[PDB]
């Protein structure tokens, strides 16, 4: 039986959104840590992390592409 490239991503998209809902602060922290890898200081990344928090699908996209390294 079949393993769609659709199924794997929807399987990962589910997990991640259940993660945004159940522990949203932890997920913000994951964005901080990715940006702070690039010597970007909290005063500089703070507002970007915040700006994602308010646009949950964009924030979800950003985990998907930049935390997990998967695409649509």
Q: Which does 33 bind (CB under 5 to 8 A by kind): Zn ion, its own copies, Co ion, none?
A: none
Which of the stretches 17-25, 31-39, 40-48, 53-61 binds Zn ion when contact is defined by CB under 5 A? Answer: 17-25
Which of the stretches 3-11, 12-20, 32-40, 53-61 binds Co ion when contact is defined by CB under 5 A? Answer: 12-20
Q: Does 12 bind Co ion (CB under 5 A)?
A: no
Angle at 51 between CA 47 and CA 53, to 5 degrees: 115
Residues in touch with Zn ion (CB under 5 A):
3, 16, 19
């Amino acid at each position: 039986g079949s393993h769609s490239e659709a199924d794997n991503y929807a399987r990962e998209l589910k997990r991640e959104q259940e993660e945004i809902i159940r522990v949203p602060d932890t997920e913000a922290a994951e964005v901080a840590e990715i940006l702070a890898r690039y010597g970007i200081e909290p005063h500089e990344y703070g507002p970007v992390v915040n700006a994602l928090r308010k646009k949950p699908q964009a924030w979800l996209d950003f985990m998907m592409k930049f935390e997990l390294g998967l695409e649509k």
